[PDB]
Amino acid sequence: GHMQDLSVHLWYAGPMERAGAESILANRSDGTFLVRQRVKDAAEFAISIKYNVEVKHIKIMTAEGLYRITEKKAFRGLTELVEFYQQNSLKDCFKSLDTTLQFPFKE
């Protein structure tokens, strides 16, 4: 509500699935990323990035209210968490990664 609103972004898919999330990202160019809202427990939202003709999906955690993709590096919320990994080389937060939140999916 004019705060941490996520639907105002283009990388936020919220009620989206894995195959669905990558549907756009896979179709989109490399670096394309998005975030969905759903899980089961050890997480809240899920981040999906198109890197290497593939879409890497991860279940964000809500540590003390902070959102984190790797759980090692978190932020205030999603925007702050997704609008930072775009600079923070995933290779440091993720694993065999070598990029960052390049582009959204609604773009």
Binding site: R18, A19, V39, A42, A43, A46, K56, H57, I58, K59, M61, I69, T70, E71, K72, C93, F94, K95, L97
Partner: peptide
């Protein structure tokens, strides 16, 4: 499993 975020990176090992 492969259909969901199989915890790719976070606290493995």
């Amino acid at each position: 499993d492969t259909e969901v975020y199989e915890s790719p990176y976070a606290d493995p090992e």
